[PDB]
C-alpha cells in the first residue's frame, strides 16, 4: 500500500511526504519540506485528520498503545513519534523506516495528520511533564491529512 | 465514528463536509460549499487521497465492486456516487445519507478524496461511455482528503 500527504500551514512552510508498506512490515517514509529554519524540527503523526482549524484541530499525538512520548528507537514512545528532521539551506529531505506506524490495521495512520514542528523534539528527555507529552516541539508549522496514493 | 474534509481548489470554491456513522448504518453527510455557479454540481468520492497535483491526482471514482457510474439510488453505481448538490446564491448547503459508503471496513472512505464538480452529474443517463464513468460532470472545482474528526 502507498500513501501521501501534502503539508501546508499559515506561512510559507510546505512539503510532501510519501509512505509505503509491503505486507504488514515496516513503513518507508520519504519526504521534502521547504521553508524551515536551520536545525532540528519535530515530525509527528497527530491523531485527527481534521484541518478545519488549521493544524490545531489535529489534536495530540497518535497513541493507541498508551505510552509516553519518546524517540523512535525507544520502547516507551507514541506510535506517532517519528523524531526530528534536519533542515539545512531552508530544506529538510529525509528517509526513515518505522515499524510502529502502519498503513493498515489498528495502528493505521491513514486519515490522520502529519505535522512538522517549530522546534526540536526533546525525545522525552527534557525533564518536565510536557516533554512526556509532546517533546516540547512547540508550534505546528505545517500539516496535512494522510491519504491513499497510486 | 466521525470524519471531515476541507475542500479547496485552484479558484474561489471552498467548503467543509462532515461525515458521521453510527454502528454500521447509513452515513450522514452534511456540508457547505461556497463559490459555486447556480444549479446542480456533481459530488463524488474519488479513490485516492493524493492532492499532490491538486484535484487531478485524486483518481477516478471509488469503485471496489467494478460497476458502472449511476445515481445514488441505482444498484449499478460506484460506491463513490453521491449524485448532485444544488447551489443557490453561490452556496450549496446539504444534508444527505448514503448506504454504500462507510467510515470503517472495506468500503471506508477515510483517506480518499471528496470532489465537487463543475457540471451536473447526468447519473449515468447521458447516452455515452463517459456518462458511465463520470456522469459527464466535468472538471474538479474543489477537493479534500477525508480524515478522522473528534
Ligand atoms: Cu507533535
Ligand atoms: Cu467525480
Ligand atoms: Zn509523542
Ligand atoms: Zn461514479
Swiss-Prot record, chains A, B:
Zn(2+) binds at residues 61, 69, 78, 81. It comes from the Eukaryota. This is Superoxide dismutase [Cu-Zn] B. Homodimer, and heterodimer of Superoxide dismutase [Cu-Zn] A and B. The keyword Zinc-finger does not apply. It catalyses: 2 superoxide + 2 H(+) = H2O2 + O2. Its main location: cytoplasm. Cu cation binds at residues 44, 46, 61, 117. It comes from Xenopus laevis (African clawed frog).
Amino acid at each position: 500500500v502507498k500513501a501521501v500527504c501534502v503539508l501546508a500551514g499559515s506561512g510559507d512552510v510546505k512539503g510532501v511526504v510519501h509512505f509505503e508498506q509491503q505486507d504488514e512490515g515496516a513503513v518507508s517514509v520519504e519526504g521534502k519540506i521547504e521553508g524551515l529554519t536551520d536545525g532540528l524540527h519535530g515530525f509527528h503523526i497527530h491523531v485527527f485528520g481534521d484541518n478545519t482549524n488549521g493544524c490545531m484541530s489535529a489534536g495530540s499525538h497518535f497513541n493507541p498503545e498508551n505510552k509516553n512520548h519518546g524517540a523512535p528507537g525507544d520502547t516507551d514512545r507514541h506510535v506517532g513519534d517519528l523524531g526530528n528532521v534536519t533542515a539545512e539551506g531552508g530544506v529538510a529531505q529525509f528517509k526513515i523506516t518505522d515499524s510502529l506506524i502502519s498503513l493498515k490495521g489498528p495502528n493505521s495512520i491513514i486519515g490522520r495528520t502529519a505535522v512538522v514542528h517549530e522546534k526540536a523534539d526533546d525525545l522525552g528527555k527534557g525533564g518536565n511533564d510536557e516533554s512526556l507529552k509532546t517533546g516540547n516541539a512547540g508550534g505546528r508549522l505545517a500539516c496535512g491529512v494522510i491519504g491513499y496514493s497510486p
